[PDB]
Design a protein around this ligand. Structure first.
Ligand SMILES: [Mn+2]
Ligand SMILES: [Mn+2]
Lengths: 198, 198
């Protein structure tokens, strides 16, 4: 079966950047729902031992009647599992990935500005991503729970702009939630993922 | 220029089904933003003296540089303007439209079940609609601020499932927000719109 992972920190550990209450709802309700529904779709079938990453990367091969749940719920499970891992109460802007961001964008701020502009203009529900595409870093958006693996790119950092991720604290002020996020990136995890995918 | 309409009731009039605070944010912020952006696009142009309905119905004829905003923001303005008018502090399940719903679905409950099922399975941001299509009633969904006029169908009832419409009160429990909505449909307004579009 797929399983809800435990958070690697306390629910209040990311205050004030993400409120405690949001982490409760977001992890115990929204993420738990993606998992439950995903299992309802695949259990008792020959897909029950297939990797999430492989199914997302090859949605076209998923059977037509299971595809929407695998896309949406499987997306939801992959994307939130990664999201918890790339957040940290001890963010230090260090690693080989940071050096390569500087090299490509000039400064860390230039990267943060391109990412922020894409996150804040993303219309509706979705995610902003840093990906490796061939050897190169790039920033992309996806709608809903869509995932750049489907397009042959490897994710190493992601930011949730579904309204449930920021409404309780920030309401409509999504740019303030963007600016907050930078303080809680687990750049260490981003770097591991980056070294593996270049 | 387009104008943010006044609510036709007090901000607390839909309590306890929709909290006062949500109506403040939803109307004074989210809807106001769609209008502002809409006007930034169309003020000083041909389109400022065109009906919103006609423009959304023929998005493809909107000039390339304006089309995205007219879709998203014009959609946002149309959709929320209608939404306030189809809510009522005294919802009574009365009108000729309900007689034709019974005729097509058997009972009002069968219609409510098909509508609920479509609203609750709509993935991401969007709207669930009752429309007339060529004489017949049908229930459809759209993503984000898309609108069935664009596909040649006339809307008479709509339900906002963007998470900003329900997060403060219901958080993740969108089915409880559906069940609550039935107690606040202005079926009288739905019926006027239906009589016009038959
Ligand atoms: Mn989320
Ligand atoms: Mn809305």
């Amino acid at each position: 079966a797929f399983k809800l992972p435990n958070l690697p920190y306390a629910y209040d550990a990311l205050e004030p950047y993400i409120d405690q209450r949001t982490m409760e709802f977001h992890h115990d309700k929204h993420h738990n729902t993606y998992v439950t529904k995903l299992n309802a779709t695949v259990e008792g079938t020959e897909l029950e031992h297939q990797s999430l990453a492989d199914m997302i990367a090859n949605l076209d091969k998923v059977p037509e009647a299971m595809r929407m749940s695998v896309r949406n719920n499987g997306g939801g499970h992959f994307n939130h599992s990664l999201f918890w891992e790339i957040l940290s109460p001890n963010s230090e802007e260090k690693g080989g990935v940071i050096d390569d961001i500087k090299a490509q964008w000039g400064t860390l701020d230039e990267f943060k500005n391109e990412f922020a502009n894409k996150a804040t203009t993303l219309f509706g529900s979705g995610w902003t991503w840093l990906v490796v595409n061939d050897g190169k870093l790039e920033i992309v958006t996806t709608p809903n729970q869509d995932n750049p693996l489907t397009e042959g790119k490897t994710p190493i950092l992601l930011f949730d702009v579904w309204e449930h991720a920021y409404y309780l604290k920030y309401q409509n002020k999504r740019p303030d939630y963007m600016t907050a996020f930078w303080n809680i990136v687990n750049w260490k995890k981003v770097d591991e993922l980056y070294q593996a995918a270049k």
